[PDB]
Design a protein around this ligand. Structure first.
Ligand code: CA
Length: 223
């Protein structure tokens, strides 16, 4: 996250770190057994880390649970990042508490102008590289589809939305991928892509979670 703020330990209790020997992606806990992340974060041997603040220090509220199963959206296109969404099942249920908690799926899509909360452990510089150890947060508005499509001509599908700041300076970035965009207490977005981070006229592009609820519910009901 570029140009954000320190969330505060476990103030984002649905935030998870995907770990494959190292943090590589975020995710969102949607119930005690299932995490939503980005399909582009797919890899084998995922360990899900819940209750994280400092990802480099065991602080005492973590739960580390291996993934049993990863399910990439059947129409995920790695070239266009259309349908950049995947589900990860935990080998054992998380214990939900004040520090580890699920985020609601949306019943309806969020409106342009809505301010959302984006979070993760990704790069904090638009040019440099500097990874934080503690969870960073950003408040960012959903942009109109017209401004989104104008920012990324020929590249925005109906399964994507833009959020952020056209002036630049504030954005999600590498290592935030898969993480949550929460608006009005519902998971509306997944950190997906963007051209660099926090660049002028290049806002973040997010998977549009409300298009996937039916798939998520059906998948969870069968796996
Ligand atoms: Ca920790």
């Amino acid at each position: 996250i570029v140009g954000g703020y320190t969330c505060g330990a476990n103030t984002v209790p649905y935030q998870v770190s995907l770990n494959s020997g190292y943090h590589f992606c975020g995710g969102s806990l949607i119930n005690s057994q299932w995490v939503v992340s980005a399909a582009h974060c797919y890899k084998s041997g995922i360990q899900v880390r819940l209750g994280e603040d400092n990802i480099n220090v065991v602080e005492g509220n973590e739960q580390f649970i291996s993934a049993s199963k990863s399910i990439v959206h059947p129409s995920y296109n790695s070239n266009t990042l259309n349908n950049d969404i995947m589900l990860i099942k935990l080998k054992s249920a998380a214990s939900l508490n004040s520090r580890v908690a699920s985020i609601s799926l949306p019943t309806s899509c969020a409106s342009a102008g809505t301010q959302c909360l984006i979070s993760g452990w990704g790069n904090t510089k638009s040019s440099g590289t500097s990874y934080p150890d503690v969870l960073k947060c950003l408040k960012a508005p959903i942009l109109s589809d017209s401004s989104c499509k104008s920012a990324y001509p020929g590249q925005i599908t109906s399964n994507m939305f833009c959020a952020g700041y056209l002036e630049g300076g504030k954005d999600s970035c590498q290592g935030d991928s898969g993480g949550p965009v929460v608006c009005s207490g519902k998971l509306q977005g997944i950190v997906s892509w963007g051209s660099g981070c926090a660049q002028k006229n290049k806002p973040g592009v997010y998977t549009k979670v409300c298009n996937y609820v039916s798939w998520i519910k059906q998948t969870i009901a069968s796996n």
